[PDB]
C-alpha cells in the first residue's frame, strides 16, 4: 500500500478504541481474544497519544507452579489514559506462552505507548494506531486531542475514571477452563458473564453488602448466585 | 516518517471531519480558508469512504466576465456522504486562480473520493484521510463504518440530511470584498455572519415569511435586517 505518500510523508499518531465494533466483554471473552504467545518477539509502537475510554484492564496472572506467569514488566513509563473504569483482574490460569499477546491486533496502550503484548500492572486500553493529520494541525486540533486534552478536560472524570475496581478473580484460563469470582471487601460472588461492568456489582456492594452480607466472619462471603438472585 | 511500517503495510482509509477543532463558519470564513490556486496541478485521494456530518457545501462561483469562474467538473462519480445540511452557495466574485484549492489541507470529499480542489456542484464535506486498521477488520468494524454504514443507518437522516438549502448568494469574494444574501422563495435577506446554520434562517422562512413578507411582488424581498430585527 505505497500509494503516493506512504513513503516518509508525516503521519500522526494516536490510539483508537476497539469498542467501535460494538465490542464489550464479560471479562473472559476479552482474554478469549488474546491468550498468550509464544517466544516470538514483542513489538511496540510510539504515539503522540491515545483515546480516553470507559472500559480498560489491569492485569496480573499466575502459574500454579509459582513462576508466576508474569507478563513482562517493561521499563517504559506506565501511566495510562483516563478510563472511566477499569477492571483489574488477577491470578492463574498459567502462561504457557512467555507473554500475553493479543490475537486481534489489539494494541495495548498506556502513556502514548502501545504493544502487541500485555504487560504486568498498568491498564491496557486496547486499540489501533491512527495515522494522518496535517503537519501543522498540532497547533490547532491537538489542543483538544489527547496531547492537550488534559487542558480541555472537564471535571467530570472525577465521577468518571475514579469509578473503578480491582477485584476480579481469574480462576483458571481459556474458554474451557476459567471462572471470575468478584471480590468486594473480602467478599466474593459467583461470576456472571450475563452481566457486565461494575456498576451492577456496585449494587451488590450497596445491597447484598447491606444485608445477606458476611455477618459471619468465618470467611470471605461466597455468595451463591442463584439465577433468581441474579434476577432480583 | 518511515517508522517500521510506513513502507507498504496496509492502511485504511476514510475521511474525517475538520470540525473536530471546534470549527464552524459564517460561510465566508469557510472560503477564507480556501480561496483559489494557481495553475499548480490538483491532487486526488482514493478512499474506502468518509464521514457523515451535519455541515457541508455545494458550490458554483462566477466571473463578472462570463467565464464564469467554474471549478473543474471532474468525471469522477459525484454522489456524496450524508450530511445533515449543506449550504449551496453561489455566484461571483471571480476565480483569478484556475481552481478552488483549500489552504487548510481540507480535502474535499464525496463518494469515497477527495481532492485538494473544490469541484463544481456536489457537496464537499471537508476533512483529512485516516490511515490504519487491521486488514481483517473489514469484515467486522466496517459493518458500522461508512462502507456499510448505510446498512446500519437509522431512519433519522430523513429529518437529517433532508433538511438543507441551496440559497446563499456569494456576492463578491475574499475577506475584503464579499457579502452573503440569503434567498428564500425568491426573497432575500441581509447576510448575518453573527448567525449560523439555516435553522435560524428557517425561522425567517416561517415567520418573516408569514408576515413582513413580500406581499408586494415588485421584486424579491430585500429584507432590511436591522440588528434589532436580528435580535427579535
Amino acid at each position: 500500500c505505497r500509494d503516493k505518500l506512504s513513503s516518509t510523508n508525516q503521519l500522526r499518531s494516536v490510539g483508537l478504541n476497539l469498542e467501535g465494533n460494538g465490542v464489550a466483554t464479560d471479562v473472559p471473552s476479552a482474554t478469549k481474544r488474546w491468550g498468550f504467545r509464544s517466544g516470538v518477539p514483542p513489538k511496540v509502537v510510539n504515539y503522540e497519544a491515545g483515546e480516553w475510554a470507559e472500559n480498560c484492564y489491569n492485569l496480573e496472572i499466575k502459574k500454579p507452579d509459582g513462576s508466576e506467569c508474569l507478563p513482562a514488566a517493561p521499563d517504559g513509563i506506565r501511566g495510562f489514559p483516563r478510563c472511566r473504569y477499569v477492571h483489574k483482574v488477577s491470578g492463574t490460569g498459567p502462561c504457557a506462552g512467555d507473554f500475553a499477546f493479543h490475537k486481534e491486533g489489539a494494541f495495548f496502550l498506556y502513556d502514548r505507548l502501545a504493544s502487541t503484548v500485555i504487560y504486568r500492572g498498568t491498564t491496557f486500553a486496547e486499540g489501533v494506531v491512527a495515522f494522518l493529520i496535517l503537519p501543522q494541525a498540532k497547533k490547532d486540533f491537538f489542543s483538544s486531542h489527547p496531547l492537550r486534552e488534559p487542558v480541555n478536560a472537564t471535571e467530570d472524570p472525577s465521577s468518571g475514571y475514579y469509578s473503578t475496581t480491582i477485584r476480579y478473580q481469574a480462576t483458571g484460563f481459556g474458554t474451557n477452563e476459567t471462572e471470575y469470582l468478584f471480590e468486594v471487601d473480602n467478599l466474593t460472588y459467583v461470576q456472571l458473564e450475563s452481566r457486565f461492568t461494575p456498576q451492577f456489582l456496585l449494587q451488590l456492594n450497596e445491597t447484598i453488602y447491606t444485608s445477606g452480607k458476611r455477618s459471619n466472619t468465618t470467611g470471605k462471603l461466597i455468595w451463591k448466585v442463584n439465577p433468581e438472585i441474579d434476577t432480583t | 516518517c518511515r517508522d517500521k511500517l510506513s513502507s507498504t503495510n496496509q492502511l485504511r482509509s476514510v475521511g474525517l471531519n475538520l470540525e473536530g477543532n471546534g470549527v464552524a463558519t459564517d460561510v465566508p470564513s469557510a472560503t477564507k480558508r480556501w480561496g483559489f490556486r494557481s495553475g499548480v496541478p490538483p491532487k486526488v485521494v482514493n478512499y474506502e469512504a468518509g464521514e457523515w456530518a451535519e455541515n457541508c457545501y455545494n458550490l458554483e462561483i462566477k466571473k463578472p466576465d462570463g467565464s464564469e469562474c467554474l471549478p473543474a467538473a471532474p468525471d469522477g462519480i459525484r454522489g456524496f456522504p450524508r450530511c445533515r445540511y449543506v449550504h449551496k452557495v453561489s455566484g461571483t466574485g471571480p476565480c483569478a486562480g484556475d481552481f478552488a484549492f483549500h489552504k487548510e489541507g481540507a480535502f474535499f470529499l464525496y463518494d469515497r473520493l477527495a481532492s485538494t480542489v473544490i469541484y463544481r456542484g456536489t457537496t464537499f464535506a471537508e476533512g483529512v484521510v485516516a490511515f490504519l486498521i487491521l486488514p481483517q477488520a473489514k469484515k467486522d468494524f466496517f459493518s458500522s463504518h461508512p462502507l456499510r454504514e448505510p446498512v446500519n443507518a437509522t431512519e433519522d437522516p430523513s429529518s437529517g440530511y433532508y433538511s438543507t438549502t441551496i440559497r446563499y448568494q456569494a456576492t463578491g469574494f475574499g475577506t475584503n470584498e464579499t457579502e452573503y444574501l440569503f434567498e428564500v422563495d425568491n426573497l432575500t435577506y441581509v447576510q448575518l455572519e453573527s448567525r449560523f446554520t439555516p435553522q435560524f434562517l428557517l425561522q425567517l422562512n416561517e415567520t418573516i415569511y408569514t408576515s413582513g413578507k413580500r406581499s408586494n411582488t415588485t421584486g424579491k424581498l430585500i429584507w432590511k435586517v436591522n440588528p434589532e430585527i436580528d435580535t427579535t
Partner: antibody
Amino acid sequence: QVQLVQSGAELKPPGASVKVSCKPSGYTFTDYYIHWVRQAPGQGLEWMGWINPKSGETHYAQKFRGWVTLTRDTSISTTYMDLTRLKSDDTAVYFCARGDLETTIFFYNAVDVWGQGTLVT
Amino acid sequence: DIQMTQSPSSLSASVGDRVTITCRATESIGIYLNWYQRKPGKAPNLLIFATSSLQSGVPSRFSGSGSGTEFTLTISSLQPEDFATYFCQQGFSSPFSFGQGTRLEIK
C-alpha cells in the same frame, strides 16, 4: 528478487556437523527473517525455528534437540545452518523459508521462497 | 502444541470443479493461519496470506476464510495447476506445526 542459494546433499555416517548455506541475492542481507525448516522425505515439514539476522537471535524451536545454530557473517550474502550431532537415523531435506523482518509481527508464517533444499542421510 | 488437522484426504479431481479444504485447530484460535500449495517435486508456495487474503499473484479462483478452530480454503473452476498438494501451516504460534491434507489426481 530473493534467491537463497543452498548447499549440496550428503550421506551420513552419524556424528557429523554439516553447516548448510542459505545465500540470498536480490536482497539486503539482514532485512528479512531467515529459515530453518526441514523435513524427512516422506514427511510433512518440521519447523526448525528461525533467526533474526539483524541480531542473530535463535527463535527457538530446534534448540530442543540443540542441533542447530547459524553462522551469520553480516558482511556476506549467506548464513549457515550449523548443525551438530547429525545422525543417519533422521534424514531430512533442509529448506530456507523467508519471513518479514522489521515489521510488527502479524505473521504470516514465512513463505517457502527457497526451495531446492539440502538432503542429508 | 496446537496440531493443524486437515481434511479432506486427497481427492480425485477434474477441470472446472469447485472444491473446499478445511483445517481443524486442536484448540480454538480465532487468529490467522496460512495455506500453501505445491507442485510435486517442488517446495510449497504460499497460497494465501494467513489472514485469508490471497498471496500476491494468486488467481481470483482461490478463496476461503475461517474462525475459531475452523478454516476453510475454497477453489473454484479447477485448472491443471490446482492439483498441487495443499497445506495448513500453523500461522500464529510456536511451534509452528505444518498441517497436511489433500492434493488432487485423476485416473
